C-alpha atoms as one frame of an Amber mdcrd trajectory, in Angstrom:
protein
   0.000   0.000   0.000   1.308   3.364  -0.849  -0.138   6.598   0.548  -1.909
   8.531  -1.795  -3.093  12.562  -1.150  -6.101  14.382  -0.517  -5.748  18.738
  -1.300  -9.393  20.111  -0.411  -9.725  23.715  -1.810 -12.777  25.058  -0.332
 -13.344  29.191  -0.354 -12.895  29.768   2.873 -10.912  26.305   3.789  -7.915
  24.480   3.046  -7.747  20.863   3.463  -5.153  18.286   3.321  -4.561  14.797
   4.167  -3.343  11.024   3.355  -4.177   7.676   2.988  -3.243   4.618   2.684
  -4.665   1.955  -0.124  -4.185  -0.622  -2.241  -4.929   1.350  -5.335  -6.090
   5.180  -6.246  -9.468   3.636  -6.481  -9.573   2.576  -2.773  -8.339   5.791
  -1.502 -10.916   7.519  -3.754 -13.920   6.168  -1.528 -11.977   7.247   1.637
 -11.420  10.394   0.702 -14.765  10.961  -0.607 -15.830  10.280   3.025 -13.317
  13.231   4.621 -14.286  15.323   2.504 -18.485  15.058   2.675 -17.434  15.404
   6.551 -15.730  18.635   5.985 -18.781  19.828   4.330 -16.473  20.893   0.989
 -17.737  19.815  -2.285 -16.771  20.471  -5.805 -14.649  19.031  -8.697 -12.608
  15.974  -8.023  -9.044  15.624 -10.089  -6.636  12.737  -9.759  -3.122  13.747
 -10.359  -1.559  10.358 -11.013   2.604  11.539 -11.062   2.011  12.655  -7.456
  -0.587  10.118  -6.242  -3.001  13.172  -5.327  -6.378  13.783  -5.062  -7.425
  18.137  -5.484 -11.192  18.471  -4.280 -11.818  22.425  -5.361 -15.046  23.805
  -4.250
């Protein structure tokens, strides 16, 4: 399992954590769960060189 990153860009908020997984897919569904709990919402990229996640309200 590597780690794999989660940047959250809300307005007013900036987010960021990690995760490990057994694939960018697994750490997708985790991080869709920090970020619904940090009330920030918006377009999801993958970034696959750095094994990040950007969440930009």
């Amino acid at each position: 399992m590597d780690t794999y990153k989660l940047i959250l860009n809300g307005k007013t908020l900036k987010g960021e954590t990690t995760t490990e997984a057994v694939d960018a897919a697994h750490a997708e569904k985790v991080f869709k769960h920090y970020a619904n709990e940090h009330g920030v919402h918006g377009h999801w990229t993958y970034d696959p060189e750095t094994k990040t996640f950007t969440v930009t309200e």
